[PDB]
Amino acid sequence: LEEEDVICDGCNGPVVGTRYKCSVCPDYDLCSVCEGKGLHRGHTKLAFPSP
Ligand SMILES: [Zn+2]
Ligand SMILES: [Zn+2]
């Protein structure tokens, strides 16, 4: 089947658990690893569960 998966704009890895979606940039997300590394710090991101 076709599934919609979230891939990290930082490491191209899967975004599972908590996803950080930028509130300004279009279709931009980070995994918790890339967030921890402090990527995309200039913009406010939305943090919510990624099932
Ligand atoms: Zn990442
Ligand atoms: Zn942004």
Side-chain angles (χ1 to χ4, degrees):
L1 69 341
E2 292 171 353
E3 282 194 354
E4 297 298 324
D5 292 321
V6 185
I7 306 301
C8 175
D9 276 282
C11 63
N12 300 337
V15 177
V16 301
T18 302
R19 70 187 277 204
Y20 300 84
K21 178 184 172 57
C22 183
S23 56
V24 182
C25 290
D27 194 87
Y28 187 93
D29 312 75
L30 300 180
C31 65
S32 60
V33 173
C34 284
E35 175 70 359
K37 293 183 173 164
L39 242 164
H40 214 84
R41 266 173 57 257
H43 290 167
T44 297
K45 296 158 271 191
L46 286 20
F48 54 97
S50 190

